[PDB]
Design a protein around this ligand. Structure first.
Ligand SMILES: Nc1ncnc2c1ncn2[C@@H]1O[C@H](COP(=O)(O)OP(=O)(O)OP(=O)(O)O)[C@@H](O)[C@H]1O
Lengths: 576, 171, 542
């Protein structure tokens, strides 16, 4: 029945939730949502078993009705508490509910006819979703014949001064990469969202989802919506924009910050299976942290982030490292074969020139690629541009919407003949220097021989490659632990501090770069044959990154001797 | 202002219980206490029923304003109470907590009372904000206590006035 | 019996609790609460080993009067161990009963809790210190030259004849077998029950105390089908409410006939039918076939497969209510008989309804032998700070940790078995192990290791010739630079016939003897050097 539910059960349910400690309610939560305009509420799905043993097993079967008996109970229990006296219910207001659980996730490949008009739980991934048009509830579907001398046959004028308005967003879902796409490609699905959950999910994230598989019109169509979404914890599966982090988390964080044995701890963090290569690694982690995007009263929106390089003989674990940098806030990865054009296609509906837009998708994330080498030049010029001004322009048809995106970039490579070029002269790149110039890092890889190193890289790998070893003994090391922390920690540290230099750093850095350029020019003159602003404006970013690390705003050049001794590697690499 | 400071005020209030003993190794403490003999009521303050009930010595029963019916009609009196309502002992928000904490091993109806007392609590509290949405012109000679209680008013005390004086000085 | 002595207990004391146990914490937290009742301050103690005990008394080397130790006693003639003991009040209450009587007599500084249907050692002292040979008691203890009020020296002959002919029973004591006996704090419950204490949570704590070693396979209950009268008679007869029990907090606790398969409640099924021994070994699942016979039983129950990989709590209703309503009757006929046992359950409130033993399998998993060097005692202080109703964020972590260990257990068993690491090596069976785990460092988990291999191999590859033979195992500690731990364990299905190995390993110690230790009050354990066992094993065969 419609009323025996609202008559007592839902209406007293919220009223009855009782554990001493005088918290265990959804009443106070409802009011402290109400006060601040939120208009929502969350529940589990296995608390009702703590109230009864039937209603839940009715919630699954006829959800669409129960989830409005809830709304009626919600407002009729909440407007009593709106009343300070009968004189401050200015007017009532509508709410939306959320429910959650921890039961079990599913996969798209089992969404079939039996799992229809029924609650579920899944786990997928996102690509993109629509804009925000509209939808409403009532105003003053079939609109029948009668009129209300004659007035004939359906003369109905909508009075939209007297209509209403809620939201509408149409979310999307693709599967995960480990549920038999092997002999296939991945399918996907489109969705639906209602009132307060637009701008709750940007594309490119891992989801938990609570939804329902229902139709619109025997070949008729699918779709799904949210029935109280939540999110993922792949380490920190969804910790990408919002904050349910608590003072405990800030406390643990900043207590880690002042701990002055964190950076040399973090130079051993990425590889619980690889040996060595530490000076290569001291600034693969700073690349995430980023420096400062300082605009000024003139134009100079100077380059914020940093950029990476590496090229070397195979056999030194390039691929795993870059896959790991993808793994550990948000990022994507391709390598070669992909663009120079952007996406001016045309929805066959309405025949216009829309802009679908994927350096877009790293506007706070980053990007990593291998093979700038083995992808030719028809698609390098748009990326020549993007990574120096970030004002990604468009001028194709009658649109000049030079949008922008702030992304960094990481580059692997492969040179011909190994260190054949790297011993002799000008075959470092085969193509051009202005994407070798326009970067920051300059880190070459070699695989030189020595018997001690040989035997050690022998047994070091065996204990790694023996029987999925690292259950016990990885975290028992000092502090080389928990990428999940690194995700949430970065998404703090980048989004708070506004650091910049001291006085004493400036003169020392100027003199040092002066000596660097002078040494380059002397190599020009000491060989009778043949230094940007970019090098200064990049190495400053490592000071930026370090001060980002320890959370000190102002940093020193003695703090940055490490950074300039990292750049020393670049200098003595391109020594010739 | 604290959760317990006003229990060094409020917990001194009186109830009436039945112990299970004869007179103790000492019979009576020189003071308003009455004599100790099992099987009959005795009137006490509240810094012992805590100490007594969990010392597994006796029973305990409440005053009369703890019921359902009186605290089901006081609310509908309160609904039209444009100012204030009935006040059973004026610090009754704390005796309830210190009773319903331990006592419910034997007390009757130990939840629905919580329901109604919060149902009065919230309505009067939200009342005690709407004084502020009409309090104009620095009217620091005109305000409300008439049948107010104390355990609510510390929930405002350090917020408004401490700044209100040095702010609304201008009028 | 201390309805008379307890009225001595007001002044200062020390409450010791010897080496870690669930009997320990259960029997001791209750006494903590008791002694904060009559306004005394007191002391709870961790023991890591008997050296920790001697230094503890060294650390408590005062004249503290009402000193207590519980669940110990068989270490020394404790008068000899304990010099400053002059008239100090000692208390034992230990269930490891087979103790010498040098500790019992000298009725000043001990408390003889001698009460049993076994009058087996009555003259047991009348010849050891009372008589002697090769030394005025007027006995062999005194002179033996025809001076003691067939030949002049047959005095000694009759003396040693009686001595040794009844060492037939002295060698029966402490030199054939060991065990435990009775409860840890059920006696203490009935003690306190005279003082009008209706603490339902105390009943739960003692239920935890019993259901540890109610494990009729690990350690015997005996009283069990008698405590289905006794404990109910404690609790059921005294009902404070015949009509008012539909209440939120701590509803008056109950009893039901349920099972001892692991963690039926909080996990899915088809992994939790997999980690116990009695359900697994009798269905043989580490081989492929066992999944098939399991599956053909799931047919007869006709549960869904998809459901059998959902948490039991997470299932829909009717199956999850009818589950045990089915399983008890159509499992008796398919190789498994004896998982159903007698236990309890209750909820605090609305969250979920904890299982009366499901703490102990988190407690055993709170033994975190971590390299921080502090954590055993912190594990104790966490454990006794866990069993309440209050601290509950941590019990879930305990359950998680427990299950991941229990599903790491099997991971080694398949690895070890089908390589045939089951070394016979003569009269008994023998196992060896190579490097360290944080899982199975300490020996509780090690006995748990042994007690899956054992049933598996010895039940399934043999005739009935050798199905009754005992067990040993290595266990290395890369912790302490190489010591090569060992534990002794019994043959199959002989409940009362328990360990030979109260001392039996000491045979080889008697022959050669190499750096052996017995630091634990636990007898069923030893500790060695890193690799000095091989010749000691050649000795330790017979
Ligand atoms: N220094 C190292 N220590 C341990 N393992 C290594 C190391 N280098 C490589 N490996 C092993 O080899 C693999 C890494 O090879 P990788 O894919 O980086 O070669 P590559 O850089 O892709 O070669 P190319 O650049 O020619 O494609 C890893 O899977 C890892 O197991």
């Amino acid at each position: 029945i419609n009323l025996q539910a609202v008559k007592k059960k839902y209406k007293e349910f919220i009223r009855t939730f009782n554990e001493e400690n005088f918290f265990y309610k959804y009443r106070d939560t409802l009011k402290r949502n109400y006060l601040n305009g939120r208009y929502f509420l969350e529940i589990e799905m296995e608390d009702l078993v703590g109230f009864d043993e039937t209603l839940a097993d009715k919630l699954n079967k006829q959800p669409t009705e129960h989830l409005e008996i809830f709304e009626e109970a919600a407002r009729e229990v909440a407007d009593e508490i709106t009343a300070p006296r009968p004189e401050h219910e200015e007017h009532m207001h509508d709410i939306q509910i959320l429910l959650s659980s921890n039961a079990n996730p599913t996969n798209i490949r089992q969404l079939k006819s039996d799992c229809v008009s029924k609650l579920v739980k899944i786990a997928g991934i996102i690509v993109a979703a629509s804009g925000i048009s509209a939808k409403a509830t009532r105003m003053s579907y079939a609109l029948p014949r009668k009129c209300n001398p004659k007035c004939p046959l359906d003369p109905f004028f909508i009075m939209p001064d007297k209509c209403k308005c809620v939201d509408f967003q149409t979310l999307k879902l693709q599967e995960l990469p480990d549920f038999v796409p092997q002999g296939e490609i991945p399918r996907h699905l489109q969705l639906f969202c209602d009132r307060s959950l637009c701008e709750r999910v940007v594309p490119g994230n891992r989801v938990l989802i609570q939804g329902i598989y229902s139709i619109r019109k025997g070949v008729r169509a699918p779709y799904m919506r949210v029935v109280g979404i939540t999110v993922d914890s792949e380490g920190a599966g969804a910790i990408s924009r919002y904050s349910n982090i608590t003072s405990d988390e800030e406390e643990h964080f900043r207590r880690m910050a002042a701990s002055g044995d964190i950076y040399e701890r973090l130079s051993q963090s990425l590889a619980p299976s690889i040996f060595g290569s530490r000076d290569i690694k001291k600034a693969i982690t700073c690349m995430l942290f980023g420096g400062s995007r300082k605009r000024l009263p003139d134009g100079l929106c100077r380059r914020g982030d940093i950029n990476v390089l590496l090229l070397g003989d195979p056999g030194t674990a390039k691929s795993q490292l870059l896959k790991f940098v993808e793994k550990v806030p948000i990022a994507v990865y391709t390598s070669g074969k992909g663009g120079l054009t952007a996406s001016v296609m045309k929805d066959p509906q309405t025949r216009n020139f829309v802009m679908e837009g994927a350096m877009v998708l790293a506007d706070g994330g980053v990007v990593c690629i291998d093979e700038f080498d083995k992808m030719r030049e028809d698609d390098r010029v748009a990326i020549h541009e993007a990574m120096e001004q970030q004002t990604i322009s468009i001028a194709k048809a009658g649109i000049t919407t030079t949008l922008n995106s702030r992304c960094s970039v990481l580059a692997a490579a492969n040179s011909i003949f190994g260190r054949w070029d790297d011993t002799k002269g000008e075959e470092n790149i085969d193509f051009m220097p202005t994407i070798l110039s326009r970067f920051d890092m300059i880190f070459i890889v070699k695989d030189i021989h020595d018997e001690s190193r040989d035997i050690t890289l022998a047994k070091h790998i065996i204990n790694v490659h023996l029987s999925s070893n690292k259950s016990a003994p990885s975290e028992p090391a000092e502090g080389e632990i928990s990428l999940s922390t690194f995700k949430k920690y970065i998404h703090y540290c980048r989004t708070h501090c506004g650091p910049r230099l001291s006085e004493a750093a400036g003169e020392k850095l100027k003199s040092r770069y002066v000596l660097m350029r002078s040494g380059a020019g002397q190599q020009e003159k000491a060989s009778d044959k043949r230094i940007t602003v970019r090098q200064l404006e990049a190495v400053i970013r490592i000071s930026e990154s370090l001060a980002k690390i320890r959370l000190q705003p102002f940093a020193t050049d003695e703090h940055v001797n490490e950074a300039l001794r990292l750049f020393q590697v670049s200098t003595l690499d391109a020594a010739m | 202002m604290d959760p317990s400071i006003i229990e060094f005020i409020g917990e001194k209030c009186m109830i009436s219980i039945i112990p299970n003993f004869s007179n103790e190794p000492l019979h009576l403490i020189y003071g308003p206490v009455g004599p100790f003999r099992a099987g009959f009521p005795v009137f006490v303050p509240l810094w012992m029923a805590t100490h007594l009930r969990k010392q597994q010595k006796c029973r305990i029963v409440p005053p009369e304003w703890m019921d359902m019916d009186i605290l089901e009609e006081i609310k509908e009196e309160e609904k039209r109470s444009k100012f204030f309502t009935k006040m059973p002992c004026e610090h009754y928000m704390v005796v309830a907590q210190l009773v319903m904490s331990t006592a419910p091993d034997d007390v009757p109806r130990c939840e629905e009372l919580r329901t109604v007392i919060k149902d009065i609590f919230d309505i009067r509290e939200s009342k005690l904000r709407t004084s502020i949405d009409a309090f104009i012109k620095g009217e620091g000679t005109y305000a409300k206590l008439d049948n107010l209680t104390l355990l609510e008013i510390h929930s405002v005390r350090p917020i408004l006035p401490y700044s209100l004086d040095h702010i609304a000085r201008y009028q | 019996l201390r309805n008379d002595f307890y009225r001595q207990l007001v002044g200062k004391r020390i409450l010791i609790v010897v080496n870690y146990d669930i009997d320990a914490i259960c029997a001791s937290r209750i006494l903590q609460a008791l002694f904060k009742y009559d306004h005394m301050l007191y002391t709870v103690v961790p023991i890591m080993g008997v050296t920790g005990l001697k230094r503890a008394y060294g650390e408590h080397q005062g004249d503290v009067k009402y000193v207590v130790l519980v669940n110990c006693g068989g270490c020394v003639d404790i008068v000899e161990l304990l010099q400053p003991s002059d008239d100090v009040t000692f208390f034992i209450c230990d269930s490891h009963r087979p103790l010498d009587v040098c500790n019992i007599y000298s009725d000043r500084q001990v408390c003889i809790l001698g009460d049993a249907s076994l009058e087996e050692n009555i003259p047991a002292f009348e010849t050891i210190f009372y008589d002697s040979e090769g030394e005025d008691s007027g006995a062999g203890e005194s002179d033996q030259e025809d001076q003691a009020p067939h030949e002049q020296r047959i005095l000694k002959q009759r003396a040693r004849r009686q001595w040794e002919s009844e060492r037939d029973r002295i060698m029966f004591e402490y030199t054939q077998f060991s065990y435990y006996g009775r409860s840890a704090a059920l006696m203490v419950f009935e003690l306190a029950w005279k003082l009008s204490k209706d603490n339902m949570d105390l009943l739960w704590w003692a239920i935890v105390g019993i259901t540890e070693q109610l494990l009729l396979g690990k350690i015997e209950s005996g009283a069990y089908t008698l405590e289905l009268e006794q404990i109910q008679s404690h609790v059921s007869r005294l009902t404070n409410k015949t009509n008012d029990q539909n209440t939120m907090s701590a509803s008056k606790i109950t009893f039901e006939n349920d099972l001892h398969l692991v963690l039926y409640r909080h996990w899915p099924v088809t992994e939790s039918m997999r980690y116990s021994r009695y359900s697994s070994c009798q269905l043989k699942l580490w081989t492929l076939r066992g999944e098939k016979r399991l599956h053909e039983l799931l047919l007869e129950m006709g549960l869904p497969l998809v459901h059998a990989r959902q948490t039991y709590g997470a299932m829909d209703l009717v199956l999850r209510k009818e589950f045990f309503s089915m399983v008890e009757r159509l499992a008796e006929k398919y190789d498994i008989a004896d998982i159903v046992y007698g236990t309890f359950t209750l909820s605090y409130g609305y969250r979920s309804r904890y299982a009366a033993a499901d703490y102990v399998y988190a407690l055993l998993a709170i033994m975190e032998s971590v390299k921080k060097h502090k954590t055993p005692e912190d594990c104790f202080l966490e454990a006794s700070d866990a069993l309440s109703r209050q601290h509950k964020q941590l019990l879930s972590a305990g359950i998680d940790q427990a299950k991941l260990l229990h599903a790491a257990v099997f991971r080694q068993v398949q690895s070890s078995l089908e390589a045939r690491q089951v070394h016979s090596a003569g009269s008994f069976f023998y196992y060896v192990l190579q490097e360290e785990h944080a899982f199975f460092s300490y020996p509780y988990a090690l006995g748990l290791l042994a007690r899956f291999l054992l049933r598996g191999h010895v039940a399934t590859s043999r005739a009935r010739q050798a199905s009754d033979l005992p067990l040993i195992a290595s266990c290395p500690l890369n912790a302490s630079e190489g010591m090569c731990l060992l534990v002794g364990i019994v043959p199959v299905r002989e409940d009362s016939p328990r360990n030979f190995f109260g001392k039996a390993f000491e045979q080889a110690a008697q022959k050669s003897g190499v750096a052996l230790l017995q630091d634990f009050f636990e007898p069923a354990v030893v500790q060695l050097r890193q690799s000095d066992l091989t010749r000691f094993l050649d000795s330790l065969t017979v």
